[PDB]
């Protein structure tokens, strides 16, 4: 039981591992989809201007 | 000079006529001119939130 109580920790070390860079990397790819939001309205403002 | 008179008088009245048919015409072409704009604008702003 010690055994597999070492390999489950294990695994939950690896999952909690996993589950940070996840967070971390949907957090900067969040941040860059909103500010590609506003971009993409910034551009439909100027071809309303343009057109 | 009796007949001469007379067109005289005959084509300044139609004169005076056709220049208040210009005047109106040309204020009805700047009235299209101006509907014709606002058809544009607001034509451009439908079709693009549409987008």
């Known amino acids: ?4 109580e070492r390999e489950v920790s ?3 070390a690896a999952a909690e591992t996993a589950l940070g860079e996840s967070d971390a990397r949907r957090q900067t790819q969040d941040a860059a989809l909103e ?3 506003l971009e993409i309205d910034r551009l439909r403002n100027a ?3 343009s057109d | 000079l009796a007949d001469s008179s007379a067109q005289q008088k005959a084509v300044e009245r139609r004169a005076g006529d056709l220049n208040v048919a210009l ?4 204020d009805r072409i700047r009235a299209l001119e ?4 606002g ?6 702003g439908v079709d ?3 987008a």
């Open chain 1, 1 to 4: 039981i010690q055994a597999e």
């Open chain 1, 10 to 12: 294990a695994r939950l």
């Open chain 1, 35 to 37: 500010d590609n939001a």
């Open chain 1, 47 to 49: 071809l309303l201007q």
């Open chain 2, 23 to 26: 005047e109106r015409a040309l």
């Open chain 2, 34 to 37: 101006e509907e014709a704009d």
């Open chain 2, 39 to 44: 058809l544009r604008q607001r034509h451009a």
């Open chain 2, 48 to 50: 693009t939130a549409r």
